[PDB]
Design a protein around this ligand. Structure first.
Ligand code: CLA
Ligand code: CLA
Ligand code: CLA
Ligand code: CLA
Ligand code: CLA
Ligand code: CLA
Ligand code: CLA
Ligand code: CLA
Ligand SMILES: CC1=C(/C=C/C(C)=C/C=C/C(C)=C/C=C/C=C(C)/C=C/C=C(C)/C=C/C2=C(C)CCCC2(C)C)C(C)(C)CCC1
Ligand SMILES: CC1=C(C/C=C(\C)CCC[C@H](C)CCC[C@H](C)CCCC(C)C)C(=O)c2ccccc2C1=O
Ligand SMILES: CC1=C(C/C=C(\C)CCC[C@H](C)CCC[C@H](C)CCCC(C)C)C(=O)c2ccccc2C1=O
Ligand code: SF4
Lengths: 145, 31, 339, 90, 160, 220, 74, 143, 80, 86
């Protein structure tokens, strides 16, 4: 046996089709070798847990980056005349005009302007300082764990 | 800060190389 | 496929070609890959460098020159031919060789020397790449018509057959007819690139109006040299700018070209239904339609059938070519009649 | 005209060495003792992979981290005041 | 009548042909003397030669076409990039050798010459031989890059 | 114009539903293939016999409905974006007059609103919209690359790969290296998925770049 | 606003395609004709031709007349 | 009551100039095929690998890389030249397996003594549903 | 190897066994049809999956069926 | 596969002489093609190592001379070898 572990038919393919089809059939538990109903249900349960962990990590990352590199406290005072910042840019391929052009908002370097509307959502529910976002990110990291 | 000068190369050049080498060794293995 | 018979019509030159076809096809494959990498890749490098804010790292007449010195030598040789290598001639064969004279008729420029630079190098290598790929598809199709390592008995199946089934991993498009079907698309690509090059170069460097003091104002103002070295330049200064004539032609005598523009767009897009789909779906769909015709006693005695695999391929390619060529035709005529 | 043999399948299947050479070593013997001494640490395939990975990881991040603004335009930073966006935005 | 092209080794049922490009005496002599085809030599020594030759070459393109070509740091940056590429190639060679060869197995190189004489199969096709080759190649490549940088930017030789 | 575009939306919804429902109901068999249930959910064809049987599985019915879904959502989003752009600029009469003919759409929505986006970088410099123009071209390239896998099918490519094996095995200094998996062309169903992923990614990236660039250039 | 609208509409379209895909997969892998005799689920397979033909008629009618009106206006 | 023919290695081969469609590393590592036939005169025939060859009068021997190539050549021989043929699979170890005609009688002629393999004693519409073989190693067919 | 199955609706035409590009199929004696014959499939390790046999069967629905399955070197038609 | 050219080095001298003899006739306004090529060679060595310019006449003379020389060499080889095979 070899990759894939869950397919005796695929594991004996002498061509490059073994890898491609090994990748594409990983999550089809019903067609794996020596599969039962109980194992199927338990695998589905574990996969759902993993999906929830990924979602919590994603939200925590968004919050941490907005708190660390954004302009949330400046945007709060004058919402209609400030551009929200998603995160910072660090690209060694950039030229000097590119460094100057992307320096917008109130930042000291190149940044990205956020268009996901997280600033308005967080301002509406009562978050006002960068300390709140850090606490939220820590709580979501704990939830993912 | 100076952290992006480390983590961006770490995630773009080192981790991909390690992962690709390990994955190739795994998929090429036989017994 | 049909008339080849070595038992009564043996020829040594044709026999020897068929005995080393693998080397020919592999060498042509490598040449095509090399030309594609070293011709189109230079355009992507230019686009990336321009987007990053580094115009000094581009392949251009100002940063990194790629001069076509072989064509310039030929131009110089042809410009100095009269009196040295063609004593009986008074002037050169053409005004484009670079003699330096200008011919103007009725306030317009007829012909004048055509300079060559970095952009011409790139576009000429693009032409070479496209022609080589087309020659690959057609020559592979001719050389493997009778047999191959995949299907030893291919000559018994004929010249125009769809496949030899889902076996051997799958055998769609193995006949010689399919190699012509695939080479039509590459011929279209190459000719489109050639005619675009001709149009932009003529409008930028040759055609224009001449004043009393002797100053030439070209149609587009000589932007070919600096704008054509990027794909964004072709999208912006050629397709976006020069399509304003055809999209503003409604309400005037040129509205027929405006209508044909959209009609050819529709015809081109309509061909993708036949190219991306397969026969079994449409034959299954017809079965349901025939059911309701039987209900009302209007079922024809000539049983409806879906198109064959070859017929569908042919319809798709025909509609694809018609739409594309008609679109370009309307665009060119509407642009050039107005200006 | 017999190209098939059962006792010898090396010639039948064409297992020939087209360009291989059996001539002895042409390098100087003292020169050979130098390289067989000093290249020897790198000849263990288990250690070489780890060494290369660790060295590449450490060297790349160190060069990146202490790079100056005369090499990287992004380490230097902007040098001009910013311009306002549309609708009078920052 | 004289004919130039002949089947490979006289067997018309093997998928190759013998042409002046493949079997010319000058071409045959030239290829047999390259390090990759010296089957009777320690793989370390062939690897050292290959590494030296390949590392020496790589400096030029990186130095001349690099992003810092028009600055005072052209040579150092180019040499460092060449060394990095050599390191990556060494990693690739090590990975290939680990994947392909198993410890304790005999060599898989052919043991028959074109004239039918029996020969000792090449030891480069074993795990130990490939490991020695890779370790020689790395040491050779680093040495060649360093030599090229030294010649170009420590001695003011009248190049170009 | 709202009337016409609403009926276009209805046409798109009905056609997509037709394709998906026909795929779901004919999954267990039909007149052309009575025993389709014995071959699974996904399989290439039943060969060239009985007139030819390309795309006869339910998976192929799903594969053909993604193109119609993308078309319908594109129409919906084009309608929404043009209406709101004209509303925000304060010139709703432009949409009212120019939305009753297709040349009006092509000229006053796509051509007119793409001027700033295609000027992100030019021979005179660059600005903050450079990345969006680059993504515009990237999406165009990825979309067109999908047509290769959709128009050209397997048996052309397996014959082409067979010559490269000979070329590698006959090349000096390179035949010392050999593969472990024998190289082959992609399968019949693989190329449908690979073509369709390229088509969707190009569609999404191109429209996202155009929308964001056009809105943010004018209103920030 | 435009980004949020486009994002959610495209996601909804993909989800709607997936629903029908998994319905077909159910009909292939899990359906049992004997346990489902003559119920609502089984009677749908009986008259699939009528449903498909009426969907075809609706699509053809809409497409014909919408395209005709647009081309007339052009 | 049939003893398969032995393979005579000293059989001469047809006159051929060589081609690029011959054997490769698979023949060295895996099996390859040999086809033999008897000819009444010298004549020209088309090689399945591309080109043309002259067959000798008397016994003939040929190596090929696939079972499809040698059965394509044998079909051509029997259809056009009216010639009988045999073919074998040769392993790198040295074992020769006789393959065809197998009985000495060709497959299209019904011959007593042949066993039935893969016969399902029902019509194709009587196969069970996939639900009835779920979570087992079997298929709807071969059941 | 692929799976090739025969059903008792076979009429003994021989057309499937004449069509196969590799020797997979053969005729055996039988009783149940006028021809007193049925196809047999003894050598399915040599099947390439071409379906030439199914194009040749005159029965309303095929008395020979091919189900594609695990792929090997022989079933892929590789001469590398 | 060896000695594929059927080496006969008398061809090199015969071809060279049979090109240099007619090409030395001064029918070009009192000058010969060989003479023009040799004068061009002499002129471009006065600024060694700077290469000839794009507008120099050296390249034309080089190509035209070597075309005839290669034709003479090839036809000499074909004639010498073909006498024994036909
Ligand atoms: C799924 C969530 C998510 C996503 C999409 C990103 C994405 C990114 N992070 Mg990141 N990050 C995350 C979670 C996430 N992060 C978390 C949970 C932490 C710990 C609090 C960090 C800590 C972090 C640092 C310290 C830095 C980044 C940086 C970056 C950017 C460069 C990539 C990089 O160096 O990766 C690094 C990713 C990690 C270390 C996360 C590990 C988990 C990239 C935009 C870099 C940056 O700003 O570049 C300009 C940078 O310096 N991240
Ligand atoms: C825009 C879409 C598109 C693109 C990019 C290609 C590209 C190609 N086609 Mg093609 N084709 C297309 C559409 C397209 N086709 C369509 C619609 C059809 C009709 C069905 C065909 C039909 C067709 C046929 C019939 C054949 C090809 C062949 C080829 C290849 C030519 C050889 C070569 O190296 O070219 C140059 C390659 C490129 C320009 C692609 C590279 C793009 C640049 C250089 C980016 C490079 C990135 C770099 C590697 C780093 C990336 C790393 C990563 C981590 C980011 C080339 C890959 C031929 C072939 O197989 O090769 C001979 C061939 O026979 N095509
Ligand atoms: C190798 C390129 C080349 C080409 C294509 C030509 C072509 C031509 N030459 Mg010419 N020529 C060449 C090189 C070349 N020449 C050289 C190297 C010389 C010596 C300097 C001359 C000297 C020459 C003379 C003296 C004359 C021509 C003339 C001509 C023209 C008629 C000749 C003929 O037989 O009809 C013809 C266009 C004749 C002419 O003027 O025709 C109008 C003529 O009188 N040529
Ligand atoms: C007299 C001929 C005739 C009649 C009575 C019908 C009647 C019908 N067709 Mg129909 N059809 C016909 C010819 C005909 N068709 C032809 C020739 C085609 C091929 C182009 C079709 C293709 C077709 C499709 C694809 C569909 C129908 C459908 C339908 C039904 C919906 C009503 C409708 O108008 O659909 C619209 C019908 C059309 C747009 C057909 C075009 C009209 C043609 C040009 C008329 C030709 C008449 C013919 C030449 C008679 C000559 C008479 C002369 C000898 C004296 C209806 C029962 C639909 C249905 O319910 O599905 C089952 C459906 O989806 N038809
Ligand atoms: C996403 C991750 C990522 C990162 C962080 C970089 C970073 C970089 N790229 Mg890059 N690149 C990437 C992805 C990435 N690239 C991809 C996906 C492509 C394919 C399209 C490219 C294609 C590309 C090209 C074509 C070029 C770069 C260049 C560069 C360098 C910018 C110029 C410079 O500082 O020269 C200064 C250079 C030096 C000081 C020497 C090299 C730096 C170290 C010391 C090399 C040795 C490191 C180590 C020994 C080897 C790696 C270890 C391994 C574990 C990773 C910079 C280090 C340019 C360059 O100069 O590269 C050499 C260049 O020409 N890149
Ligand atoms: C196409 C890219 C390219 C570039 C920019 C260079 C650039 C360079 N090469 Mg180089 N080289 C190249 C391709 C290239 N090479 C190739 C393809 C080969 C193999 C045929 C070589 C083989 C080569 C040798 C053998 C030497 C150079 C040397 C040099 C350097 C001195 C140049 C000189 O004096 O002349 C220079 C940095 C010389 C050098 O570095 O001397 C210290 C030197 O000795 N090169
Ligand atoms: C909650 C959402 C959800 C869940 C749990 C599943 C779960 C499943 N789907 Mg699925 N699907 C979904 C949404 C979902 N789907 C949607 C929204 C669509 C429409 C786009 C589809 C379309 C779809 C198809 C067309 C197929 C499945 C299949 C499957 C099964 C195997 C998955 C597999 O092999 O992927 C492995 C992962 C990959 C192949 C990577 C995907 C690579 C793409 C191109 C982008 C990267 C598995 C039970 C398969 C199945 O059951 O076969 C019988 C199958 O053929 N799904
Ligand atoms: C722009 C391209 C395009 C167009 C116009 C269509 C149009 C259509 N598709 Mg479609 N499709 C396309 C692309 C396209 N598709 C693509 C890319 C795919 C993915 C592969 C599909 C997949 C697809 C499926 C899966 C299905 C359709 C179906 C349909 C039809 C239902 C819509 C309707 O009401 O008819 C609109 C009516 C017309 C277009 C009629 C115009 C008639 C004019 C008058 C013709 C004039 C003839 C000529 C000028 C006169 C003779 C001159 C001579 C030179 C010819 C419709 C014909 C469905 C179908 O056929 O079932 C009902 C169906 O099930 N399509
Ligand atoms: C109160 C009110 C109202 C109401 C409304 C309503 C009543 C609505 C409805 C709605 C609806 C009513 C909707 C619906 C929908 C549906 C759908 C969307 C469907 C789908 C389906 C599917 C997807 C399927 C699947 C499947 C198959 C195919 C087979 C197997 C089974 C299954 C199920 C899996 C109004 C507004 C008037 C007014 C105001 C008030
Ligand atoms: C749309 C489509 C069809 C369906 C198209 C069909 C059936 C073609 C025939 C359509 C015309 C309109 C039939 C005309 C019939 C009569 C001539 C009508 C006479 C009445 C008046 C018009 C005079 C296929 O059959 C097909 C097959 C293989 C690959 C792709 C496709 C494909 O894409
Ligand atoms: C181009 C083409 C090929 C040939 C293409 C091949 C063999 C490409 C193979 C992959 C190469 C090596 C490029 C891989 C690029 C990926 C970005 C790398 C892997 C990414 C991972 C995430 C998997 C087919 O095999 C084919 C088969 C059937 C119908 C159409 C086609 C078809 O159009
Ligand atoms: S029917 Fe279509 S998909 Fe099937 S093998 Fe033939 S061409 Fe390929």
């Amino acid at each position: 046996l070899r990759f894939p572990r869950f397919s005796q038919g695929l594991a004996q393919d002498p061509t490059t089709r073994r890898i491609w089809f090994g990748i594409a059939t990983a999550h089809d538990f019903e067609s794996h070798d020596d599969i039962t109903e109980e194992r199927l249900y338990q695998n589905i349960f574990a996969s759902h847990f993993g999906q929830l962990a990924i979602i919590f990590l994603w939200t925590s990352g968004n919050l941490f980056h907005v708190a660390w590199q954004g302009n949330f406290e400046t945007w709060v005072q004058d919402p209609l005349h400030v551009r929200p910042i998603a995160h910072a840019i660090w690209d060694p391929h950039f030229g000097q005009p590119a460094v100057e052009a992307f320096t917008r908002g109130g930042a000291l370097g190149p940044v990205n302007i956020a268009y996901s509307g997280v600033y308005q959502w967080w301002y509406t529910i009562g978050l006002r300082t960068n300390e709140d976002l850090y606490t939220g990110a820590l709580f979501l990291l704990f939830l993912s764990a | 800060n100076n952290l992006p000068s480390i983590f961006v190369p770490l995630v773009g050049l080192v981790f991909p190389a390690i992962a690709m080498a390990s994955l190739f060794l795994h998929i090429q293995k036989n017994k | 496929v049909r008339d080849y018979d070595p038992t009564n019509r043996y020829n040594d030159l044709l026999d020897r070609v068929l005995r080393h076809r693998d080397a020919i096809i592999s060498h042509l494959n490598w040449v095509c890959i090399f030309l594609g990498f070293h011709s189109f890749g230079l355009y992507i490098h230019n686009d990336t460098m321009s987007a990053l804010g580094r115009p000094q790292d581009m392949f251009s007449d100002t940063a990194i020159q790629l001069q076509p010195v072989f064509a310039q030598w030929i131009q110089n040789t042809h410009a100095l031919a009269p009196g040295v290598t063609a004593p009986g001639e008074t002037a050169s064969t053409s005004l484009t060789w670079g003699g330096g004279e200008l011919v103007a008729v009725g306030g317009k420029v007829a012909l004048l020397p055509i300079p060559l630079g970095t952009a011409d190098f790139l576009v000429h290598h693009i032409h070479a790449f496209t022609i080589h790929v087309t020659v690959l598809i057609l020559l592979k199709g001719v050389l493997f018509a009778r047999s191959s390592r995949l299907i030893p008995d291919k000559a018994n199946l004929g010249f125009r057959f769809p496949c030899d089934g889902p076996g051997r991993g799958g055998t769609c498009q193995v006949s010689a007819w399919d190699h012509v079907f695939l080479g039509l698309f590459w011929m279209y690509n190459a000719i489109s690139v050639v005619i675009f090059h001709f149009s932009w170069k003529m409008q930028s460097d040759v055609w224009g109006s001449i004043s009393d003091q002797g100053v030439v104002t070209h149609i587009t103002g000589g932007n070919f040299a600096q704008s054509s070295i990027t794909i964004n330049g072709w999208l912006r200064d050629f397709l976006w700018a020069q399509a304003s004539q055809v999209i503003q032609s409604y309400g005037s005598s040129l509205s027929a070209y405006g209508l044909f523009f959209l009609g050819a767009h529709f015809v081109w897009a309509f061909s993708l239904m036949f190219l991306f789909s397969g026969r079994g779906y449409w034959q299954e769909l017809i079965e349901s339609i025939v059911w309701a015709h039987n209900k009302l006693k209007v079922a024809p005695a000539t049983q409806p059938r879906a198109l064959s695999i070859i017929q569908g391929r042919a319809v798709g390619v025909t509609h694809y070519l018609l739409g594309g060529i008609a679109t370009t035709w309307a665009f060119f005529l509407a642009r050039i009649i107005a200006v | 005209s017999v190209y098939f043999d059962l006792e010898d399948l090396g010639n039948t299947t064409g297992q020939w060495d087209v360009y291989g050479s059996d001539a002895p070593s042409p390098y100087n013997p003292l020169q050979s003792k130098f390289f067989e001494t000093f290249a020897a640490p790198f000849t263990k395939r288990g250690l070489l992979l780890k060494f290369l990975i660790l060295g590449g990881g450490s060297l790349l991040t160190y060069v990146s981290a202490n790079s100056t603004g005369d090499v990287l335009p992004i380490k230097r930073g902007p040098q001009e005041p910013p311009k306002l966006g549309p609708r009078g935005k920052l | 009548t004289f004919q130039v092209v002949q089947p490979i080794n006289g067997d018309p049922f093997i998928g190759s042909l013998e042409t002046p490009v493949t079997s010319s005496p000058l071409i045959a002599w030239y290829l047999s003397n390259l390090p990759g085809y010296r089957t009777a030599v320690n793989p370390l020594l062939r690897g050292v030669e290959v590494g030296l030759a390949h590392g020496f070459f790589l400096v030029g393109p990186f130095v001349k076409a690099g992003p810092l070509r028009n600055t005072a740091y052209a040579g150092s940056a180019g040499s460092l990039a060449a060394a990095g590429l050599v390191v990556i190639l060494s990693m690739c060679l090590t990975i290939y050798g680990i994947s392909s060869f198993k410890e304790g197995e005999p060599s898989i190189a052919p043991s028959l010459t074109l004239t039918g004489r029996k020969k000792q199969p090449d030891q480069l096709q074993t795990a130990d031989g490939w490991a020695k080759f890779t370790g020689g190649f790395f040491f050779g490549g680093i040495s060649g890059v360093t030599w090229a940088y030294f010649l170009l930017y420590v001695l003011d030789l009248p190049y170009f | 114009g709202d009337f016409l575009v609403h009926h276009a939306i209805a046409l798109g919804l009905h056609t997509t539903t037709l394709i998906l429902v026909k795929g779901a109901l004919d999954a267990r068999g039909s007149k052309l293939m009575p025993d389709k249930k014995d071959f699974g959910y996904s399989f290439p064809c039943d060969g060239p016999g009985r007139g030819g049987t390309c795309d006869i599985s339910a998976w192929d019915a799903f594969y053909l409905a993604v193109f119609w879904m993308l078309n319908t959502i594109g129409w919906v989003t084009f309608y929404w974006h043009w209406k709101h752009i004209t509303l925000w600029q304060g010139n709703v009469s432009q949409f009212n007059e120019s939305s009753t003919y297709l040349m009006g759409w092509l000229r006053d929505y796509l051509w007119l609103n793409s001027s700033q986006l295609i000027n992100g970088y030019n021979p005179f410099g660059m600005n903050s919209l450079s990345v969006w123009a680059w993504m515009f071209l990237f999406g165009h390239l990825v979309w067109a690359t999908g047509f290769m896998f959709l128009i050209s099918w397997r048996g052309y490519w397996q014959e082409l790969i067979e010559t490269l094996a000979w070329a590698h095995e006959r090349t000096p200094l390179a035949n010392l290296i050999r593969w472990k998996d024998k190289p082959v062309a992609l399968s019949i169903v693989q190329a449908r998925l690979v073509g369709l992923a390229h088509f969707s990614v190009g569609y999404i990236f191109t429209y996202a770049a155009f929308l964001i660039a056009s809105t943010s250039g004018k209103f920030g | 606003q435009a980004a949020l609208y486009t994002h959610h509409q495209y996601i909804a379209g993909f989800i709607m395609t997936g629903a029908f895909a998994h319905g077909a997969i159910f009909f292939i892998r899990d359906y049992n004709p004997e346990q489902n005799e003559d119920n609502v689920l089984a009677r749908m397979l009986d008259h699939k031709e009528a449903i498909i033909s009426h969907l075809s008629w609706a699509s053809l009618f809409l497409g014909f007349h919408t395209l005709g009106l647009y081309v007339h206006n052009d | 009551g049939f003893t398969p023919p032995q393979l005579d290695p000293n059989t001469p081969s047809p006159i051929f100039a060589g081609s690029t469609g011959g054997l490769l590393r698979k023949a060295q590592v895996e099996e390859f095929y040999v086809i033999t036939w008897n000819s009444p005169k010298e004549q020209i025939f088309e090689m399945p690998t591309g080109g043309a060859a002259i067959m000798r009068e008397g016994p003939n021997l040929l190596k090929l890389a696939r079972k499809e190539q040698c059965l394509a050549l044998g079909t051509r021989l029997r259809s056009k030249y009216k010639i009988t043929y045999q073919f074998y699979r040769v392993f790198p170890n040295g074992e020769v397996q006789y393959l065809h005609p197998k009985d000495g009688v060709y497959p299209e002629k019904a011959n007593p003594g042949r066993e039935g393999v893969g016969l399902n004693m029902r019509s194709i519409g009587k196969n069970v549903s996939p639900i009835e073989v779920k979570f087992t190693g079997k298929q709807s067919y071969d059941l | 190897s692929h799976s090739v199955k025969i059903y008792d609706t076979c009429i003994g035409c021989t057309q499937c066994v004449r069509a196969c590009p590799t020797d997979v199929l053969e005729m055996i004696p039988w009783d149940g049809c006028k021809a007193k014959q049925i196809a047999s499939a003894p050598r399915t390790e040599d099947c390439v999956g071409c379906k030439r046999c199914e194009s040749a069967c005159p029965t309303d629905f095929l008395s020979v069926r091919v189900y594609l399955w695990h792929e090997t070197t022989r079933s892929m038609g590789l001469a590398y | 596969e060896r000695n594929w050219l059927r080496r006969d080095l008398n061809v090199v001298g015969f071809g060279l002489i049979g090109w240099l003899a007619p090409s030395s006739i001064p029918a070009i306004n009192g000058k010969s093609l060989t003479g023009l090529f040799f004068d061009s060679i002499g002129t471009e060595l006065a600024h060694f190592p700077t290469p000839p310019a794009l507008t120099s006449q050296f390249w034309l003379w080089l190509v035209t001379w070597h075309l005839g020389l290669f034709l003479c060499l090839t036809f000499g080889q074909i004639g010498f070898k073909g006498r024994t095979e036909d």
